[PDB]
Design a protein around this motif. Structure first.
Motif, PDB file in Angstrom:
ATOM      1  N   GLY A 153     -30.091  57.824  -5.199  1.00  0.00           N
ATOM      2  CA  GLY A 153     -30.045  56.504  -4.597  1.00  0.00           C
ATOM      3  C   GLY A 153     -30.457  56.518  -3.138  1.00  0.00           C
ATOM      4  O   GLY A 153     -31.579  56.898  -2.805  1.00  0.00           O
ATOM      5  N   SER A 154     -29.546  56.101  -2.264  1.00  0.00           N
ATOM      6  CA  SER A 154     -29.821  56.062  -0.833  1.00  0.00           C
ATOM      7  C   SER A 154     -28.691  56.717  -0.043  1.00  0.00           C
ATOM      8  O   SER A 154     -27.553  56.786  -0.510  1.00  0.00           O
ATOM      9  CB  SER A 154     -30.012  54.616  -0.368  1.00  0.00           C
ATOM     10  N   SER A 155     -29.014  57.196   1.153  1.00  0.00           N
ATOM     11  CA  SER A 155     -28.028  57.849   2.007  1.00  0.00           C
ATOM     12  C   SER A 155     -27.506  56.886   3.068  1.00  0.00           C
ATOM     13  O   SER A 155     -28.281  56.280   3.807  1.00  0.00           O
ATOM     14  CB  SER A 155     -28.638  59.083   2.675  1.00  0.00           C
ATOM     15  N   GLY A 156     -26.185  56.751   3.138  1.00  0.00           N
ATOM     16  CA  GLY A 156     -25.581  55.861   4.113  1.00  0.00           C
ATOM     17  C   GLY A 156     -24.445  56.518   4.871  1.00  0.00           C
ATOM     18  O   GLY A 156     -23.620  57.217   4.284  1.00  0.00           O
ATOM     19  N   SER A 157     -24.403  56.294   6.181  1.00  0.00           N
ATOM     20  CA  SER A 157     -23.363  56.875   7.023  1.00  0.00           C
ATOM     21  C   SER A 157     -23.476  56.363   8.455  1.00  0.00           C
ATOM     22  O   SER A 157     -24.482  56.584   9.128  1.00  0.00           O
ATOM     23  CB  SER A 157     -23.456  58.401   7.005  1.00  0.00           C
ATOM     24  N   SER A 158     -22.434  55.677   8.916  1.00  0.00           N
ATOM     25  CA  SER A 158     -22.417  55.130  10.267  1.00  0.00           C
ATOM     26  C   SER A 158     -22.391  56.248  11.306  1.00  0.00           C
ATOM     27  O   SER A 158     -21.772  57.290  11.097  1.00  0.00           O
ATOM     28  CB  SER A 158     -21.203  54.217  10.455  1.00  0.00           C
ATOM     29  N   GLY A 159     -23.070  56.022  12.427  1.00  0.00           N
ATOM     30  CA  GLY A 159     -23.113  57.017  13.481  1.00  0.00           C
ATOM     31  C   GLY A 159     -22.109  56.740  14.583  1.00  0.00           C
ATOM     32  O   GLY A 159     -22.080  55.644  15.145  1.00  0.00           O
ATOM     33  N   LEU A 160     -21.283  57.733  14.892  1.00  0.00           N
ATOM     34  CA  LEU A 160     -20.271  57.590  15.933  1.00  0.00           C
ATOM     35  C   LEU A 160     -20.919  57.425  17.303  1.00  0.00           C
ATOM     36  O   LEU A 160     -21.964  58.012  17.582  1.00  0.00           O
ATOM     37  CB  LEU A 160     -19.341  58.805  15.938  1.00  0.00           C
ATOM     38  N   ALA A 161     -20.290  56.624  18.157  1.00  0.00           N
ATOM     39  CA  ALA A 161     -20.802  56.386  19.501  1.00  0.00           C
ATOM     40  C   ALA A 161     -20.858  57.680  20.305  1.00  0.00           C
ATOM     41  O   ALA A 161     -19.998  58.553  20.181  1.00  0.00           O
ATOM     42  CB  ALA A 161     -19.947  55.353  20.217  1.00  0.00           C
ATOM     43  N   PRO A 162     -21.891  57.810  21.150  1.00  0.00           N
ATOM     44  CA  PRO A 162     -22.083  58.995  21.990  1.00  0.00           C
ATOM     45  C   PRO A 162     -21.040  59.095  23.098  1.00  0.00           C
ATOM     46  O   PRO A 162     -20.591  58.090  23.654  1.00  0.00           O
ATOM     47  CB  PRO A 162     -23.477  58.786  22.587  1.00  0.00           C
ATOM     48  N   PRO A 163     -20.642  60.332  23.429  1.00  0.00           N
ATOM     49  CA  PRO A 163     -19.648  60.591  24.474  1.00  0.00           C
ATOM     50  C   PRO A 163     -20.179  60.283  25.870  1.00  0.00           C
ATOM     51  O   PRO A 163     -19.528  59.591  26.653  1.00  0.00           O
ATOM     52  CB  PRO A 163     -19.364  62.089  24.329  1.00  0.00           C
ATOM     53  N   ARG A 164     -21.365  60.800  26.175  1.00  0.00           N
ATOM     54  CA  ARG A 164     -21.983  60.580  27.476  1.00  0.00           C
ATOM     55  C   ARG A 164     -23.392  60.016  27.321  1.00  0.00           C
ATOM     56  O   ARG A 164     -23.842  59.740  26.208  1.00  0.00           O
ATOM     57  CB  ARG A 164     -22.030  61.887  28.270  1.00  0.00           C
ATOM     58  N   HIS A 165     -24.084  59.847  28.443  1.00  0.00           N
ATOM     59  CA  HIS A 165     -25.442  59.315  28.432  1.00  0.00           C
ATOM     60  C   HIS A 165     -26.462  60.425  28.672  1.00  0.00           C
ATOM     61  O   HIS A 165     -26.150  61.446  29.285  1.00  0.00           O
ATOM     62  CB  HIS A 165     -25.595  58.227  29.495  1.00  0.00           C
ATOM     63  N   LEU A 166     -27.679  60.218  28.184  1.00  0.00           N
ATOM     64  CA  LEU A 166     -28.745  61.201  28.345  1.00  0.00           C
ATOM     65  C   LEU A 166     -29.667  60.821  29.500  1.00  0.00           C
ATOM     66  O   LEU A 166     -29.729  59.660  29.902  1.00  0.00           O
ATOM     67  CB  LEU A 166     -29.553  61.323  27.052  1.00  0.00           C
ATOM     68  N   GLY A 167     -30.384  61.809  30.027  1.00  0.00           N
ATOM     69  CA  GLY A 167     -31.295  61.557  31.129  1.00  0.00           C
ATOM     70  C   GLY A 167     -32.590  62.332  30.998  1.00  0.00           C
ATOM     71  O   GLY A 167     -32.579  63.549  30.811  1.00  0.00           O
ATOM     72  N   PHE A 168     -33.713  61.625  31.094  1.00  0.00           N
ATOM     73  CA  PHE A 168     -35.024  62.254  30.982  1.00  0.00           C
ATOM     74  C   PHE A 168     -35.757  62.223  32.320  1.00  0.00           C
ATOM     75  O   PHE A 168     -35.988  61.155  32.888  1.00  0.00           O
ATOM     76  CB  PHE A 168     -35.860  61.551  29.912  1.00  0.00           C
ATOM     77  N   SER A 169     -36.122  63.401  32.817  1.00  0.00           N
ATOM     78  CA  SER A 169     -36.826  63.509  34.089  1.00  0.00           C
ATOM     79  C   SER A 169     -37.965  64.520  33.995  1.00  0.00           C
ATOM     80  O   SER A 169     -38.051  65.288  33.037  1.00  0.00           O
ATOM     81  CB  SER A 169     -35.856  63.919  35.199  1.00  0.00           C
ATOM     82  N   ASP A 170     -38.837  64.513  34.996  1.00  0.00           N
ATOM     83  CA  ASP A 170     -39.971  65.429  35.029  1.00  0.00           C
ATOM     84  C   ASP A 170     -40.713  65.424  33.696  1.00  0.00           C
ATOM     85  O   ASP A 170     -41.305  66.426  33.298  1.00  0.00           O
ATOM     86  CB  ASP A 170     -39.500  66.847  35.358  1.00  0.00           C
TER      87      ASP A 170
END
Length: 108
Positions: free
Chosen positions: A1-18
């Motif tokens: 069939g299909s795969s279902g599963s809610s994603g838990l909220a992230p603990p911290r935030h990510l940062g992209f540089s350079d």
């Protein structure tokens, strides 16, 4: 069939540089809990190039690549905790544009 599963909220935030057209630096503010190892996994949208890098639980920053240009890459920093579940910080980043493959003359 299909795969279902809610994603838990992230603990911290990510940062992209350079960020580059063939790479991108991904760093975080560190998880609220201690970790033993960290396995980051990046994949190109619309199902494309994918990879996986390893880093120490102490490492709060890791580079990725070789990536693509003007292409979004879904970065997910997976922090494998020492016998206590694991987290996954999701973060999207658009790589920079790459220079035309056309090669010509040059000057000293």
């Amino acid at each position: 069939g299909s795969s279902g599963s809610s994603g838990l909220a992230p603990p911290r935030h990510l940062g992209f540089s350079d960020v580059s057209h063939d790479a991108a630096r991904v760093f975080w503010e560190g998880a609220p809990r201690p970790v033993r190892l960290v396995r980051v996994t990046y994949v190109s949208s619309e199902g494309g190039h994918s990879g996986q890098t390893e880093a120490p639980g102490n490492a709060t920053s890791a580079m990725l690549g070789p990536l693509s240009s003007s292409t979004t890459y879904t970065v997910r920093v997976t922090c494998l905790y020492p016998g206590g579940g694991s987290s996954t910080l999701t973060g999207r980043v658009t790589t920079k544009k790459a220079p035309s493959p056309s090669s010509g003359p040059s000057s000293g």
